[PDB]
């Protein structure tokens, strides 16, 4: 049962916390329940505070040399550490008894209305930390919430909001449609299905495919793809997309013929370092990590225009002799299983 700690450059101000990441249930998330330590004989006069923010951010914190820090906040809060102003948790009381009378508790509840931590892959011509959304904690001592801070009087920390696989499965993913050409009723049906509506990272996806070709043409080529889609809702509604794994297939279907087969595909990161704008689940500071999970929305409509959002779909395409290529698609979720 370890606990984390972080301190001011003067050491006199220090904070203690038992978590870094917090699990969204779509109806609750565990509270922030930290404790702050300082004997006020140092500060002697000013008032002590602790704060929250979730911020959209761009550009690194380390001494960059280009315009940066497009610091639109998503949500903020403040609380008074001292003078004394709901009741402390078990760990907070044990930690008090450990630390002593100069350590004081503080508390927050995260609303059920805000995004997860995510980030995008920078391009080679980009520099510093590419745009993303972060959760952050900072405490400091001042005559007011407005007054200017100092290094000795403050401390700063980072945390994450995270989601996991739901318990309940859903219906089977499959789709089909019919093409036909102007000469007659002769037609071209196309069809496919997948293993499950859900997967974990690194799993193989099997795509079953079928074609009924009673048309005037020969199906000449096959292609299949899985694509990342992202939504950005800061002030405008806006969208981005990337093909993230793709396969070409050499099968064919003559007219007055029928065909079916299965293929397999595997999303992975290593081959796509360079695709500027590829989406990742949020790292703490600079680390490597897996492709972003399919964030899951609540059951209610809500506002829904907050920060960043993402999801995935498969696409299937028939390429046909003497014209008439056609495609079909389906959505699916991808996220980590619930930890033990």
């Amino acid at each position: 049962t370890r606990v984390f700690k972080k301190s001011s450059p003067n050491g006199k101000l220090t904070v203690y916390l038992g978590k870094r990441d917090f699990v969204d249930h779509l109806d609750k998330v565990d509270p922030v329940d930290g404790v702050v330590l300082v004997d006020p004989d140092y500060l002697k006069d000013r008032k002590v505070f602790v704060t929250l923010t979730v911020a959209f951010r761009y550009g690194r914190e380390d001494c960059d040399v280009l315009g940066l820090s497009f610091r639109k906040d998503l949500f903020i809060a403040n609380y008074q550490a001292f003078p004394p102003t709901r009741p402390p948790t078990r760990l907070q009381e044990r930690l008090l008894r450990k630390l002593g009378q100069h350590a004081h508790p503080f508390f927050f509840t995260i609303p059920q209305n805000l995004p997860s931590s995510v980030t995008l892959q920078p391009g080679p011509e980009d520099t510093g930390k590419a745009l993303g959304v972060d959760f952050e904690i900072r405490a400091f001592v001042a005559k007011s919430l407005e007054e200017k801070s100092h290094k000795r009087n403050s401390v700063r920390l980072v945390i994450r909001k995270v989601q996991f696989a739901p318990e309940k499965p859903g219906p089977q993913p499959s789709a089909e449609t019919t093409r036909h050409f102007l000469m007659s009723d002769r037609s071209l049906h196309l069809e496919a299905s997948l293993d499950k509506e859900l997967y974990y990272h690194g799993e193989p996806l099997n795509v079953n495919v079928h074609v009924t070709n009673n048309s005037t043409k020969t199906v000449k080529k096959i292609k299949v793809s899985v694509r990342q889609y992202a939504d950005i809702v800061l002030f405008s509604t806006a969208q981005y997309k990337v093909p993230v794994a793709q396969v070409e297939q050499d099968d064919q279907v003559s007219p007055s013929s029928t065909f079916s087969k299965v293929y397999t595909i595997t999303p992975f990161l290593a081959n796509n370092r360079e695709k500027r704008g590829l989406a990742l689940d949020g790292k703490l500071k600079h680390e490597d990590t897996n492709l972003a999970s399919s964030t899951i929305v609540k059951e209610g409509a809500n506002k829904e225009v907050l920060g960043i959002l993402v999801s995935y779909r498969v696409k299937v395409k028939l390429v046909v002799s003497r014209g008439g290529d056609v495609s079909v698609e389906l959505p699916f979720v991808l996220m980590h299983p619930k930890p033990h």
Binding site: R2, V3, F4, K5, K6, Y16, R94
Partner: peptide
């Protein structure tokens, strides 16, 4: 420096 860990006592 960075962050650091500590104990539970009792």
């Amino acid at each position: 420096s960075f962050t650091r860990s500590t104990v539970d006592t009792m």
